[PDB]
Ligand binder design. Structure first.
Ligand SMILES: C=C1/C(=C\C=C2/CCC[C@]3(C)[C@@H]([C@H](C)CCCC(C)(C)[N+](=O)[O-])CC[C@@H]23)C[C@@H](O)C[C@@H]1O
Lengths: 239, 10
């Protein structure tokens, strides 16, 4: 039937947070180490991911209630979910006609091959690309896209979470907002909520394979040295 | 550890 002011407020907060941390001009990308097309794209993509991690952190800090988690819990959530949030938010540059992420310039058009030249295999890139395609076809409203990122960040079922109850309740509030939003505002969305929760499951699997391949990278110092300090901290295994 | 993350999280 309708949404409450508290719920509508959450949507507004999330949408603003995302506009504040996602720059459609991609003008900052020239400041990364340039793309080169053994492992020639690793410097450029490591910089891209490092920058994106800062952006996800800025997004998280503006999720209602995230700030009020303990610092361990905030780190716990971010360490396990960063690569997933990056995969979600990257859908906004993904194009179906190119099967690539198009970030303004032709030098910042990442086809699948570019990502192979940064150390990954089709065991990751193939599901990643089909994931982007299925997600792009959902034709998500901005509100739904940002709600999913928030919901994904605030999953209590991450290793290292201590205040399980608090985070779960937060995630409950967001799911309720999403499920309500879709009902009232998304014409023909009767099945959209379940399609989105499935993508959260898909992201867990992409996280797993990514962590596998990142391990192989980081165990070769001649490649890990190309990463950034932020990437090493976030994707690393410290507790 | 998590020196950068703490800082960025303020
Ligand atoms: C990052 C975004 C964008 C594109 C995202 C794509 C395009 C390139 C390939 C990427 C990075 C995948 C890579 C397997 C991650 C490898 C991470 C790295 C440290 C280098 N490593 O080797 O472990 C995940 C996501 C993919 C552009 C824009 O939408 C902003 C948004 O944040």
């Amino acid at each position: 039937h309708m949404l409450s002011d508290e719920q509508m407020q959450i949507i507004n907060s999330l949408v603003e947070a995302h506009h504040k941390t996602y720059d459609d001009s991609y003008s900052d990308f020239v400041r990364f180490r340039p793309p080169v097309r053994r492992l020639s794209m690793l410097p450029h993509l490591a910089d891209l991911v490092s920058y994106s991690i800062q952006k996800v952190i800025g997004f998280a800090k503006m999720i209602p209630g995230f700030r009020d988690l303990t610092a361990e819990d905030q780190i716990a959530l971010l360490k396990s979910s960063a690569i997933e949030i990056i995969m979600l938010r990257s859908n906004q540059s993904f194009s179906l006609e190119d099967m690539s992420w198009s970030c303004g310039g032709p030098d910042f058009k990442y086809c699948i091959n570019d990502v192979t030249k940064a150390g990954h295999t089709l065991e990751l890139l193939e599901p990643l690309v089909k994931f982007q395609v299925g997600l792009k076809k959902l034709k998500l409203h901005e509100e739904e896209h940002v709600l999913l990122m928030a919901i994904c960040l605030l999953s209590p079922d991450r290793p290292g979470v201590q205040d399980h109850v608090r985070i779960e309740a937060l995630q409950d509030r967001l799911c309720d907002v999403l499920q309500a939003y879709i009902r009232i505002q998304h014409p023909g969305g009767r099945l959209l909520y379940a399609k989105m929760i499935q993508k959260l499951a898909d992201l867990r699997s992409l996280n797993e394979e990514h962590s596998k391949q990142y391990r192989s990278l980081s165990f070769q110092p001649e490649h890990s040295m190309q990463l950034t300090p932020l990437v090493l901290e976030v994707f690393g295994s410290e507790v | 550890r998590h020196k950068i993350l703490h800082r960025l999280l303020q």
